[PDB]
Amino acid sequence: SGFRKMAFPSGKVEGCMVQVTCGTTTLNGLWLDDVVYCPRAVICTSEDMLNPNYEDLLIRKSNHNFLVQAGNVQLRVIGHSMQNCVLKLKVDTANPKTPKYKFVRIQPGQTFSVLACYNGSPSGVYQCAMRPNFTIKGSFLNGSAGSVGFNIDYDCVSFCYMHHMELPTGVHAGTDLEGNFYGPFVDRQTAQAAGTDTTITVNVLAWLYAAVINGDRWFLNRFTTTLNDFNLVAMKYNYEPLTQDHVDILGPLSAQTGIAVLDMCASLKELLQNGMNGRTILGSALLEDEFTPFDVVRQCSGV
Amino acid sequence: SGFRKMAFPSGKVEGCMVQVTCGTTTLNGLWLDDVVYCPRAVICTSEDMLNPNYEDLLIRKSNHNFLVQAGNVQLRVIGHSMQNCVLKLKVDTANPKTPKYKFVRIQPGQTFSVLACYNGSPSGVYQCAMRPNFTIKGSFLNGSAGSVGFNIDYDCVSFCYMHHMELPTGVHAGTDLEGNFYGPFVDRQTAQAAGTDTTITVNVLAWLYAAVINGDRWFLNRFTTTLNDFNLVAMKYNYEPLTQDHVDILGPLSAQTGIAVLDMCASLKELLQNGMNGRTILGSALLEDEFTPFDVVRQCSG
Amino acid sequence: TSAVLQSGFRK
Amino acid sequence: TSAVLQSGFR
């Protein structure tokens, strides 16, 4: 029993984190085989962080301008290039701890584990969802750029996020590992703002199923709704529309609990219309949308 | 910015998890130098769980009755002993990935990271506080016994918790790494119940300070309270009494924010008496008590 | 209910 | 507001 925000074990990623320094600018890099990946913001100077021309900045650098450190072991840079908002620094040593991995671009609503790092040293691990407005609600300070988000399948690490920046509302923006930003954001300190966000409906339903699996049943009712009538209510409360594909992904959960998806949508509707009346679900007085259906199965089945 | 329930990186602990099996009973063990530590419940059978005599069960076993696996590599047990509720299995191979470590016994109100494991394999990592009634609100299924809770300082792992059991309310009970239970619990499937729990006041205050450091200020007020008047309200809402020791450990957070501890206690009092009126603090509609003052500082800017 | 010792079963 | 690039100082 129990249901927690649970990260993947971070060991395989800790062994890939390095420190990258250019002048007085430092951040984290990801060391896979003989390539270190890091945000190109490391070549930005403190005086021109507003309008950097990174192509210019990069031409003016040489390999020896990049200080890469795996702990105390200094890694010599022997080649450099820029792909979108990430730098690829070729080093003379392949990381002997490189895991099986892939670079993937995740969709809004999917979750991943963040290994927050400073000066190349892992400091903490937590779960995040990619919000519909393409930000994440992380916990990041100066020096955290280059920390990565990932999922693990068997022993294969899927890197999906590299951290770059913080937006004015205190949420976080970054790229995939090919350097393409999630969301309409850019790696410079100009005026930028997160778009309006929405709640991930399929995840709230997943978490209601988790709640039932853990014995919370007070929010169930004998009613059912149509998908169209539910989406009518969802729009009113700024929830993403629920699609037939979402209903299908919730199948294993409905099957295990015996609660049809549209029966649970009737519970969600009542919770949206009336609130919780002082009760809690899995320890929360708010409807939680940062667990996917997959996250619930992983934790309630213990994979 | 931001404030999340953040676990320590689990790498140094993952390399210590093994699988221990006796007959058809399996659970997890912790492999440090040439010793594997695990719950003694592994020597029980499905029939000896209501009132087992573990001294008896252990004399009836030999080294070869314990199958220890570090992945697929089988570890040969060359000695066994029982310390309180844990077994120590001496093995022929010292763990080459043993971190600098110590065993510590934590107090109620302190937090730690749990590496949940099944069959010797890590499955996830999360933060947990030791509740005032000595349970933890974990996430544990059958097979998770032997998973450990830990804190990391520099490169030193302080192991503080080994998982044993789930109580009828769905909360979790275990031992320190010397095998002594936290709380008045025993490793038998008898009727046992967590005592009444309370809210960790010093942690709620730490977390209000985190909220201020992150820009939530709506709950502040111009009032201050006495420690005595605050504790009358804490008693009414089932919060632990706040001591001068707690006021002192909030010192750095109070200095950084410029909000005196007893000024923040007047905020907490108002929140207890009136609620949040539809507002949230750091993304929560409830007052959060699972962050220590140390957890706030570690994670927040200064 | 009673406490549950959360060992697992194997083969 | 402006974005903050969360590199650090050495």
PDB file of C-alpha atoms in Angstrom, chain A residues 1-12 14 115-116 122-128 137-141 166 170 172 280 283-286 290 298-303, chain B residues 1-12 14 115-116 118 122-129 137-141 166 170 172 280 283-286 290 298-301:
ATOM      1  CA  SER A   1       0.000   0.000   0.000  1.00  0.00           C
ATOM      2  CA  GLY A   2       0.772   3.697  -0.315  1.00  0.00           C
ATOM      3  CA  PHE A   3       1.171   5.959  -3.289  1.00  0.00           C
ATOM      4  CA  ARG A   4       4.087   8.342  -3.621  1.00  0.00           C
ATOM      5  CA  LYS A   5       5.663  10.552  -6.233  1.00  0.00           C
ATOM      6  CA  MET A   6       8.409   8.070  -7.079  1.00  0.00           C
ATOM      7  CA  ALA A   7      11.462   8.735  -9.234  1.00  0.00           C
ATOM      8  CA  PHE A   8      13.404   6.122 -11.102  1.00  0.00           C
ATOM      9  CA  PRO A   9      16.612   5.022  -9.337  1.00  0.00           C
ATOM     10  CA  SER A  10      19.204   7.529 -10.544  1.00  0.00           C
ATOM     11  CA  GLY A  11      22.454   5.518 -10.396  1.00  0.00           C
ATOM     12  CA  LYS A  12      22.787   5.016 -14.167  1.00  0.00           C
ATOM     13  CA  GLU A  14      24.720   9.918 -11.880  1.00  0.00           C
ATOM     14  CA  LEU A 115      18.329  14.453 -11.434  1.00  0.00           C
ATOM     15  CA  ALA A 116      19.056  17.963 -10.176  1.00  0.00           C
ATOM     16  CA  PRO A 122      23.993  15.087  -8.432  1.00  0.00           C
ATOM     17  CA  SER A 123      22.119  16.696  -5.540  1.00  0.00           C
ATOM     18  CA  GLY A 124      18.581  15.301  -5.706  1.00  0.00           C
ATOM     19  CA  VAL A 125      16.012  13.358  -7.618  1.00  0.00           C
ATOM     20  CA  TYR A 126      12.267  14.031  -8.188  1.00  0.00           C
ATOM     21  CA  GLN A 127       9.385  13.410 -10.596  1.00  0.00           C
ATOM     22  CA  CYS A 128       8.037  16.020 -13.024  1.00  0.00           C
ATOM     23  CA  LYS A 137       7.296  22.637 -12.217  1.00  0.00           C
ATOM     24  CA  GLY A 138      10.779  21.743 -11.009  1.00  0.00           C
ATOM     25  CA  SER A 139      13.133  22.860  -8.280  1.00  0.00           C
ATOM     26  CA  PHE A 140      16.213  24.427  -9.871  1.00  0.00           C
ATOM     27  CA  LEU A 141      18.722  27.081  -8.814  1.00  0.00           C
ATOM     28  CA  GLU A 166      13.563  29.537 -15.271  1.00  0.00           C
ATOM     29  CA  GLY A 170       9.025  30.112 -11.243  1.00  0.00           C
ATOM     30  CA  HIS A 172      11.162  25.716 -15.786  1.00  0.00           C
ATOM     31  CA  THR A 280      -8.611  13.906   0.873  1.00  0.00           C
ATOM     32  CA  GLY A 283      -3.250  12.493   1.122  1.00  0.00           C
ATOM     33  CA  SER A 284      -4.123  15.376  -1.176  1.00  0.00           C
ATOM     34  CA  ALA A 285      -6.850  17.990  -0.946  1.00  0.00           C
ATOM     35  CA  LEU A 286      -6.293  18.803  -4.659  1.00  0.00           C
ATOM     36  CA  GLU A 290       1.275  14.415 -12.428  1.00  0.00           C
ATOM     37  CA  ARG A 298       4.432   0.741 -12.233  1.00  0.00           C
ATOM     38  CA  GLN A 299       3.973   1.604  -8.554  1.00  0.00           C
ATOM     39  CA  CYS A 300       0.786  -0.282  -7.692  1.00  0.00           C
ATOM     40  CA  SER A 301       2.232  -3.466  -9.410  1.00  0.00           C
ATOM     41  CA  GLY A 302       5.874  -2.838  -8.291  1.00  0.00           C
ATOM     42  CA  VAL A 303       7.827  -3.399 -11.543  1.00  0.00           C
TER      43      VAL A 303
ATOM     44  CA  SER B   1      12.897  28.499  -7.605  1.00  0.00           C
ATOM     45  CA  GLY B   2      10.493  25.742  -6.966  1.00  0.00           C
ATOM     46  CA  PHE B   3      10.154  23.392  -4.047  1.00  0.00           C
ATOM     47  CA  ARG B   4       9.725  19.652  -4.434  1.00  0.00           C
ATOM     48  CA  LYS B   5       9.902  16.557  -2.272  1.00  0.00           C
ATOM     49  CA  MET B   6      13.417  15.668  -3.364  1.00  0.00           C
ATOM     50  CA  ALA B   7      15.195  12.350  -2.608  1.00  0.00           C
ATOM     51  CA  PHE B   8      18.930  11.867  -2.460  1.00  0.00           C
ATOM     52  CA  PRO B   9      20.477  10.305  -5.567  1.00  0.00           C
ATOM     53  CA  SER B  10      20.209   6.573  -5.025  1.00  0.00           C
ATOM     54  CA  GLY B  11      23.263   5.384  -6.964  1.00  0.00           C
ATOM     55  CA  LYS B  12      25.464   4.622  -3.938  1.00  0.00           C
ATOM     56  CA  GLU B  14      21.571   0.678  -5.563  1.00  0.00           C
ATOM     57  CA  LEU B 115      14.987   3.061  -2.323  1.00  0.00           C
ATOM     58  CA  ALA B 116      12.036   0.692  -2.882  1.00  0.00           C
ATOM     59  CA  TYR B 118      11.910  -6.004  -5.224  1.00  0.00           C
ATOM     60  CA  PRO B 122      15.705  -1.062  -7.222  1.00  0.00           C
ATOM     61  CA  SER B 123      12.354   0.083  -8.536  1.00  0.00           C
ATOM     62  CA  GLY B 124      11.958   3.692  -7.285  1.00  0.00           C
ATOM     63  CA  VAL B 125      13.073   6.392  -4.925  1.00  0.00           C
ATOM     64  CA  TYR B 126      11.039   8.727  -2.736  1.00  0.00           C
ATOM     65  CA  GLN B 127      11.185  10.901   0.382  1.00  0.00           C
ATOM     66  CA  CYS B 128       9.608   9.923   3.693  1.00  0.00           C
ATOM     67  CA  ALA B 129       9.395  11.401   7.190  1.00  0.00           C
ATOM     68  CA  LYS B 137       3.831   6.716   4.993  1.00  0.00           C
ATOM     69  CA  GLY B 138       5.655   4.747   2.337  1.00  0.00           C
ATOM     70  CA  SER B 139       4.819   2.911  -0.853  1.00  0.00           C
ATOM     71  CA  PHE B 140       5.596  -0.754  -0.340  1.00  0.00           C
ATOM     72  CA  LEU B 141       4.210  -4.037  -1.734  1.00  0.00           C
ATOM     73  CA  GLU B 166       2.737  -2.804   6.658  1.00  0.00           C
ATOM     74  CA  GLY B 170      -1.625   1.191   5.171  1.00  0.00           C
ATOM     75  CA  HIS B 172       4.823   1.152   7.292  1.00  0.00           C
ATOM     76  CA  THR B 280      -2.574  27.206  -1.995  1.00  0.00           C
ATOM     77  CA  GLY B 283       1.089  23.956  -4.773  1.00  0.00           C
ATOM     78  CA  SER B 284      -0.637  22.354  -1.736  1.00  0.00           C
ATOM     79  CA  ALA B 285      -4.067  22.928  -0.194  1.00  0.00           C
ATOM     80  CA  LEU B 286      -2.828  21.227   2.993  1.00  0.00           C
ATOM     81  CA  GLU B 290       7.476  16.320   5.674  1.00  0.00           C
ATOM     82  CA  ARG B 298      19.451  22.206   1.170  1.00  0.00           C
ATOM     83  CA  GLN B 299      16.979  22.820  -1.579  1.00  0.00           C
ATOM     84  CA  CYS B 300      16.269  26.584  -1.406  1.00  0.00           C
ATOM     85  CA  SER B 301      18.478  29.517  -2.313  1.00  0.00           C
TER      86      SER B 301
END
